C-alpha cells in the first residue's frame, strides 16, 4: 500500500482511489491529515526533521507531480499514476458538493479564499462552503480562526498556506481542529479565484 | 504568445514548443533565465515584489502543474506541463549534441547520484560538474568559477522556488551559461 521516497511514505494510489479514501474518511469521526508530497517536499523533508516526522504521521500521502512518480520507477511496484494535488482537491469537492459536506477555506491573501468560494459555488452547484479566512495570520489570531472553523461545523478544511507551513499548522493543531479532513492545498485558491 | 496569471507572464507553449525554444536559446550568446511557474509560485509572487519582478524578467516561463492551466481557462494554456518532464525532455535531446551541463543543488551526494543516473538514462550526456546546494558565500565563488571554467552551457538549479530564481537572477552577469533553469526537487527524484 505504501512506498518510501527518501524517508517520505507515499500511498500507492491512483486519483480515483485517493478520492474514494477521502470519501471513506468522512465516515470516521476523527481528524484525518492529508498531504500531497511532490519532489520539492521530499527535498525539503531531508533538511527539516519536524516536517519529515509530520509526513510520517499523516493518514494519506497522495503523490503530487511527475518527479515523485519517476523516483518510484526503481520499485517492482511503482506509483500507478501522475496525480496533481490541485485536481485531487477539485475531484473531491465535485463528489461532496451534492452531499451537504461542510467545507471551510483557510489561506491565501485578503479576499482570495472568498473569490475561490464564489467560483466553486458556480463550478459545483450546491457546494456547502460554510466559511473562509485569509492565510497571513499570526499565532495570536490562530485560536479565534480554529474556533470559527469548529463553530461553523466544518467537516473538510482546505489549508492554502504552502508547504511546509500548511502541514505544520494542521499537525500542531491536530487536537484543536474538529474537522474530519484537513488538507494542505498550496496555491490552489489563487488559481480558482480568477 | 504570453498570458498574464495574476501579474505572472506565462508563455502559451506546449512542452514540445518549450523544448524547441530551449534548443534555439543554445544558438544565442547570452544568459537565458527559464522558470516553470505553478499555482504555488503565483501565490508567492503576490507577496514578494522582488520575486514578481524576476518572473517578469525571465526569457521563458513554462506553465507547471494543473492549477495554473485551470486559471488560464478564463482565456487558454494549450496543455498541462510538468517542469520535471521539460528538464528530462530537454536533456534527452541535447545528450547526443555534446551540450555541457552543470548540476547545482540538493543535499550531500544527491547531485552526483543524479549525474550518474542521467549518464545511464541518456548515454553520451555531458555533465561536466555537480555541486550540492547548501553552500556558503565563499563556495558560490568556487561554484561560479567551476561552472565557467568547465564551459557549461546549461545550468540546472535545484534550490527550490523562490531561492533558485533569485540565485540565478542575482548572478545573471556572473554566469557564462546560455541557460539557467530552476528545477526544485528534480535531482532528488532522479537520484
Numbering used by the authors:
A (entry chain A): 3 to 196
B (entry chain E): 3 to 77, 80 to 195
Describing publication, verbatim:
The TagA N-acetylmannosamine transferase catalyzes the first committed step in WTA biosynthesis. To gain insight into the mechanism of catalysis, we determined the 2.0 Å crystal structure of the TagA enzyme from Thermoanaerobacter italicus (TagAΔC, residues Met1-Gly195). TagAΔC contains the highly conserved amino acid region that defines the WecB/TagA/CpsF family, but lacks 49 C-terminal residues that target the protein to the membrane (see below).
Selenomethionine (SeMet)-labeled TagAΔC in its apo-form crystallized in the P21 space group as a dimer, with eight molecules per asymmetric unit. The subunits in the dimer are related by two-fold non-crystallographic symmetry and possess similar atomic structures; their heavy atom coordinates can be superimposed with an RMSD of 0.11 Å. Each protomer consists of eight β–strands and nine α-helices that form two distinct regions. The arrangement of the six parallel strands forming the β–sheet resembles a Rossmann fold commonly found in nucleotide-binding proteins. Analytical ultracentrifugation (AUC) experiments indicate that TagAΔC dimerizes in solution with relatively weak affinity, with a monomer-dimer dissociation constant (Kd) of only 7.4 ± 0.7 μM. Consistent with the native and SeMet-labeled proteins adopting similar quaternary structures, introduction of V43E and A72R mutations into TagAΔC disrupts dimerization.
